[PDB]
Amino acid sequence: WGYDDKNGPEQWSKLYPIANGNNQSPVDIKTSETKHDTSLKPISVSYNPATAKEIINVGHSFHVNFEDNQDRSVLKGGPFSDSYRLFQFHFHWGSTNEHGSEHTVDGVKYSAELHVAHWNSAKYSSLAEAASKADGLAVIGVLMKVGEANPKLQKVLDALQAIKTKGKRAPFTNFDPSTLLPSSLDFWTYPGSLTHPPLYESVTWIICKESISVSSEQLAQFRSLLSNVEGDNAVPMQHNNRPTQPLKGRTVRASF
Ligand SMILES: [Cl-]
Ligand SMILES: [Cl-]
Ligand SMILES: [Hg+2]
Ligand SMILES: [Hg+2]
Ligand SMILES: [Hg+2]
Ligand SMILES: [S]
């Protein structure tokens, strides 16, 4: 599976029949159809920069991993009753600077998207177990709009030189991903899935109401990582966003 004409999104069902499930992500958020839910609390994120651990090129993307041994870095509030432990952050982008986000708002596709993932440590003993459960994961999604360069992304951009090709990894320490979220405490939430294989329907989405910026030159940098292993022929990481999927009756709730 990948994002090419041959093993891409429109072919994932041949292999993962859940790709055509009822709670597939991402989705288009129609602001005229969202539902205000007065029970939604403000999200509370409390991350410990010492839990930052490594950066790795996985082929279709790059992941920034955190030690998830204890509850030093957690997310509380919003729609939840339990606390979710921080395990990673990653990005989605497209072949063009204008259209590469996964979630869309009122039919409008953004430039890119940041996903901050956490697992339910209050009910599951590990991420492996929790990943396939309805309440297993919580992911904060932040829409990225091309404009002014975002200086908060720097340390991440700088680390990329060390993981140019597939399987490469490097220490990535003393970082607080809360530095990347917008000031706004308002969001949309809906039940869904991972946006790539295995496509498990175990994610409760938290989509920020506010977007962050990024310049075209920062995006070109993501686009420059290679999908191939070292020594082979260059194949860039051109794109990795999945098209929106039908809502099939789910409700998108708003905290405002
Ligand atoms: Cl929020
Ligand atoms: Cl995902
Ligand atoms: Hg694309
Ligand atoms: Hg993702
Ligand atoms: Hg948010
Ligand atoms: S946000």
CB-based contacts of 230, cutoff 8 Å, min separation 6: 164, 165, 166, 167, 168
CB proximity list for 54: less than 8 A, separation 6 or greater = 64, 65, 169, 170, 171, 172
C-beta of residue 56 within 8 angstroms of C-beta of residue 63: yes
- How far is the centre of ligand 3, averaged over its atoms, from the C-alpha of 241 (Å)? 7
Could you tell me which of 172, 247, 177 has the C-alpha nearest to residue 21? 247
Measured by CA distance, the residue closest to atom 1 of ligand 6 is 208
60 is an active site residue = yes
Residue 182 Cβ inside 6 Å of ligand 6? The answer reads: yes
For CA atoms 198, 180, 146, 234, give the dihedral sign.
Answer: negative
Resolution for this experimental structure (Å): 2.0
One-letter amino acid identity for 231? G
Contacts of 231 (CB under 8 A, 6+ apart): none
Binding-site positions for substrate read: 195-196
Known binding-site residues equal: 60, 63, 90, 92, 115, 195-196
Among the options 36, 60, 103, 239, which is catalytic? Answer: 60
Residue 226 CA, ligand 1 centroid: distance in Å: 33
Sequence ranges of the domains in the chain = 1-256
User: So what's the architecture of 1-256 in CATH?
Assistant: Roll (3.10)
Please list, in sequence order, all residues whose beta carbon lies within 8 angstroms of the beta carbon of residue 2, skipping any fewer than 6 positions away. Answer: 8, 59, 60, 227
90 vs 55, 114, 241, CA distance in Å? 10, 6, 12
Indicate whether residue 42 lines ligand 6 (CB < 6 A): no
- Give, as residue ranges, everything with CB less than 5 Å from ion ligand 1: 43, 185, 187
Q: H/E/C letters for each residue in the chain?
A: CCCCCCCCHHHHHHHCHHHHCCCCCCCEECCCCCEECCCCCCEEEECCHHHEEEEEECCCCEEEEECCCCCCCEEEECCCCCCEEEEEEEEEECCCCCCCCCCEECCEECCEEEEEEEEECCCCCCHHHHCCCCCCEEEEEEEEEECCCCHHHHHHHHHHHHHCCCCCEEECCCCCHHHHCCCCCCEEEEEECCCCCCCCCCEEEEEECCCEEECHHHHHHHCCCECCCCCCCCCECCCCCCCCCCCCCCCCEECC
Under 8 Å CB-to-CB from 91, ≥6 apart: which residues?
A: 61, 62, 112, 113, 114, 115, 144, 222
Closest CA to 196 of 243, 238, 161, 229: 243
Strand-pair partners of 105: 29, 108
- How many residues comprise the chain? 256
The answer to whether the CB of 239 falls within 8 A of the CB of 93 is yes
Measured in whole angstroms, the distance separating CA 184 from the mean position of its chain's CA atoms is: 18
* Cα separation, 97 vs 6, whole angstroms: 23
Burial of 217 (0-12, 13-18, 19+ CB in 10 A): exposed
Q: In what order do the strands lie in the sheet with 108-109?
A: 28-29, 104-105, 108-109
Q: Tokens representing 143?
A: 């829409």
| Best CA proximity match to 90, nearest among 14, 36, 40, 144 | 144
Q: Does residue 210 line the site of ligand 6, with CB under 6 A?
A: yes
Residue 49 one-letter amino acid: P
Is the Cα dihedral 125, 129, 134, 140 positive or negative?
positive
Q: How many CA atoms lie within 13 A of 62 on its CB side?
A: 29
In the numeric block, which tokens belong to residue 37? 């839910």
Q: Is 143's C-beta closer than 6 angstroms to any atom of ligand 6? A: no
Q: How far is CA 225 from the centre of its chain?
A: 18
